[PDB]
Symmetry: C3
Subunit: 114 residues, 3 copies
Amino acid sequence: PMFIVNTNVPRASVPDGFLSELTQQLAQATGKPPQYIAVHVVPDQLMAFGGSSEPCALCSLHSIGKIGGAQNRSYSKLLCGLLAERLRISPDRVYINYYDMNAANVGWNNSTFA
Amino acid sequence: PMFIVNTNVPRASVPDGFLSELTQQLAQATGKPPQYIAVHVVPDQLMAFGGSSEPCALCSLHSIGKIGGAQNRSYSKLLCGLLAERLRISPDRVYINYYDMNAANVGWNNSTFALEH
Amino acid sequence: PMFIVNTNVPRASVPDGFLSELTQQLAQATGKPPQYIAVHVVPDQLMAFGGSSEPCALCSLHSIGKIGGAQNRSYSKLLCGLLAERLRISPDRVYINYYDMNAANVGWNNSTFALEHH
Ligand SMILES: *[C@@H](c1cccnc1)c1ccc2cccnc2c1O
Ligand SMILES: *[C@@H](c1cccnc1)c1ccc2cccnc2c1O
Ligand SMILES: *[C@H](c1cccnc1)c1ccc2cccnc2c1O
């Protein structure tokens, strides 16, 4: 799994430990070992949500499996919770795109996971 | 809906009003209220199109529905037009990836848009 | 085809001509003319891979067709090789997401690549 967050929140507002907390919580939530987990945080972005430039975030979670109705609702509660607590972004100004990747379509270490 | 534009055009060349124009024109084009529309503009990028570093853009549009043959061609005319007028990027140096998202695969406000089951 | 690389490697560590090299190599690999290849490299990113901030990369390759089991394995060897040689990123700290795009879902030049039906 890999999680990307793009936000207009300033870099200085991203707390020490944020990437590590995302890694650990995503490990817990997806059931995948933490050595698999990639996280990517992009602050200081030029963004608007609903026409407003108040804090917001556009995110993606890719995973090989473990993507679906109830699972994605659980991920959203977890991830919105973290974005609200750590970056002070309101959950209703967050979008998260979920992608169920086929193993043949994820490259790693000179090959793929197929 | 969310629209992202990544471009090698400098930040200083992005005109006042650009994010708001994108928001408004996308609301009109998709027939969805502007309150739902997210836009993201990323200037000053290291990118090439056809091996040339002349102005170009790589974009994404995500929507739950309202994605398809004729609709996507209309979005391209709209969005290429705006990128040409506002950022002076040639339409033949723009790619836009269109994504028809399933409601169960879009998170928002602690949940997703799949509330039925 | 479009190839995006996001990495925590410094901008200064990206060789001049890297974009051109990626363009040429991708043209050859995909069999598409270079005029249609787009490349995008994003350095200095705040990233972790397996909980570590050692050099890593998260990438995307989009193509209309020419995506598949054997082909993707070939692309991974090629692209991991270039990232290792040019950016000094270990192949086991690279992810590449492959996307087989439908022609109707790729916009270009005021339209899309679905030109056959109305
Ligand atoms: C548009 C959208 C935003 C982010 C990712 N994919 C699509 C969007 C947002 C909210 C909606 C709510 C109800 C119905 N449709 C919606 C969209 O299409
Ligand atoms: C490659 C591409 C570019 C942007 C998004 N997805 C894929 C591409 C570009 C143009 C083409 C024209 C004809 C046939 N195939 C094409 C591609 O694969
Ligand atoms: C994490 C991942 C990263 C990028 C795209 N999709 C998923 C990941 C990595 C390796 C795996 C191997 C087997 C099964 N699942 C995996 C993941 O989810």
